[PDB]
Design a protein around this ligand. Structure first.
Ligand SMILES: CC#Cc1cncc(-c2cccc([C@]3(C4CC4)N=C(C)C(N)=N3)c2)c1
Length: 375
């Protein structure tokens, strides 16, 4: 049953805080590495040299199928950077499709604040499109090579839990309930989508819908938080604060830089509101909503030291580069990256979040008798 969806189920480990990752092999003989599943980037980039935070790394000299491309790559981010060398080599996913492809690989030789202590992965699998690949869009991303070189359908789905499942090439109906609702992929670079309405405990934020997508909105498995443009973030917070006003938290909580803790088992979920993000539908002015519980946007921080308590970071934070629907949004949903039809599907996940009062949900259609996208 190698490569059956059944065999791909449960192939991810990790958590929203440090990343979800899938086992991969590179080279011949195969070198086993854990790799971040990242829909917010487009390079297959792997530690290729010793580093304090790396338990293992890619050793190209030991791979006889490695091919050097004689091209450097330097990738700086807001937070930290990496530098490396491009080449190609044979790549497979042991708990993924039953196939081996030749793929681009950036062998990371130096990096600053890129690898994460105790995340247990050694590289990143950028699943977004070539337009954002480094050094440029001519470096073919992994998934494109996979589809090109095999009979794998041009679609993958992610079921993140809090490991989860990355199903390549198809939809595993055992991983969701109810209906699958699709939002268009606006442009093939990041997985760009359009948010048309935002409610907090059913109260509309009442902003021009372009504000929700200033200057883009993306679906990013490589981002922990729900990240919101400043104007939207401020309104969300004001609204969540109002909803939970029976308890006050330091401003550092709201800034995401400080835990809030309750005695084990006593988190007052009921004082936090639900968040509804309405996503553009596949037909004009029809939309559907995905609803997010505090169990999602309050990210638990596991720490033996604080373990008499349950502690959390606020996992909604401010962005100056557009909305990011990160891991805490994707968790408890089954998310279908249907590249073939240029759409992203959402359905309630088998591992969704709920208590006895409320539950994560995917609901539609909603009709609204304006273009919500930015240029
Ligand atoms: C879920 C999760 C997670 C997670 C936790 N810590 C670190 C990372 C992490 C570590 C290194 C880089 C990145 C990266 C970068 C390639 C562009 N940056 C971004 C916003 C993204 N989508 N991928 C993320 C991910």
């Amino acid at each position: 049953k190698k490569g059956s969806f059944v065999e791909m189920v449960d192939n991810l480990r990790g958590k929203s805080g440090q990343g979800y990752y899938v086992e991969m092999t590179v080279g011949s003989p195969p070198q086993t590495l854990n790799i971040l599943v990242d829909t917010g980037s487009s390079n297959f980039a792997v530690g290729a040299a010793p580093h304090p935070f790396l338990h293992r790394y890619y050793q190209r000299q030991l791979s006889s199928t490695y091919r050097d491309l004689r091209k450097g790559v330097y990738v700086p981010y807001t937070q930290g950077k990496w530098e490396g060398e491009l080449g190609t080599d044979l790549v497979s996913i042991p708990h993924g499709p039953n196939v081996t492809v030749r793929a681009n690989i950036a062998a990371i030789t130096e990096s600053d604040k890129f690898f994460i202590n105790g995340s247990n992965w050694e590289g990143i699998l950028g699943l977004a499109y070539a337009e954002i690949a480094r050094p440029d869009d001519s470096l073919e991303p992994f998934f494109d090579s996979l589809v090109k070189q095999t009979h794998v359908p041009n679609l993958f789905s992610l079921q993140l839990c809090g490991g989860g499942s990355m199903i390549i090439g198809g939809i595993d109906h055992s991983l969701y309930t109810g209906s699958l609702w699709y939002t268009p992929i606006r442009r093939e670079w990041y997985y760009e989508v359009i948010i048309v309405r935002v409610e907090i405990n059913g109260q509309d934020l009442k902003m021009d819908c372009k504000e929700y997508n200033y200057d883009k909105s993306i679906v990013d498995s490589g981002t922990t938080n729900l990240r919101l443009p400043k104007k939207v973030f401020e309104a969300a917070v004001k609204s969540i604060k109002a909803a939970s006003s029976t308890e006050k938290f330091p401003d550092g909580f709201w800034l995401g830089e400080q835990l809030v803790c309750w005695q084990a088992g006593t988190t007052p979920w009921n004082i936090f509101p639900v968040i509804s993000l309405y996503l553009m539908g596949e037909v004009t002015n029809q939309s559907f909503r995905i609803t997010i519980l505090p169990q999602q946007y309050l990210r638990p921080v596991e720490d033996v030291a604080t373990s008499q308590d349950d502690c959390y970071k606020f996992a909604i934070s401010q962005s100056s580069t557009g909305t990011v629907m990160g891991a805490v949004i994707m968790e408890g949903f089954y998310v279908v990256f249907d590249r073939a039809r240029k759409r992203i599907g959402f359905a309630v996940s088998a591992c969704h979040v709920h208590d006895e009062f409320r539950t994560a949900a995917v609901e539609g259609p909603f009709v609204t008798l304006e273009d919500c996208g930015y240029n």
